[PDB]
């Protein structure tokens, strides 16, 4: 027995909305989370 | 008046996503391959050392 | 002789300078969408 999906994989759209309102801090708060992965997680990478 | 027996065949049928030779592909649902560059689907390789 | 017997000889002789200018088939053309085999789906699947 094996498992799969039920019907082909659908496109989905990203990039409409780009919202360009993009602050300071949540840029630093991104970043500091982004780096800790490196030595957390090497090969899950969000 | 007296019956009559029908004996129908049946087929099994065929969908190629229950198959299991769809472990070798990625099946993509798609619309419009018409708006495609030619020959042109770059993929950019980094190999570390 | 073919390019000056042409009309418009201002923009004929600069339109046929694209075969030198032009390296990839996307150069003079912006970027605007992306279209995701899911939501993020890989690095290694093929984005358009």
Known sequence: AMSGPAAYASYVVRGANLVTAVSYGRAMRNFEQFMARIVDHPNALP | EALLGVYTNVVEFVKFLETALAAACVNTEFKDLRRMIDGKIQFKISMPT | ?48
């Open chain 3, 1 to 48: 002789a073919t390019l000056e017997q042409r009309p418009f000889p201002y923009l004929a002789t600069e339109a046929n300078l694209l075969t030198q200018i032009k390296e990839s088939a996307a150069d003079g053309l912006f970027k605007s969408f992306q279209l995701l085999l899911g939501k993020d789906a890989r690095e290694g699947s093929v984005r358009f």
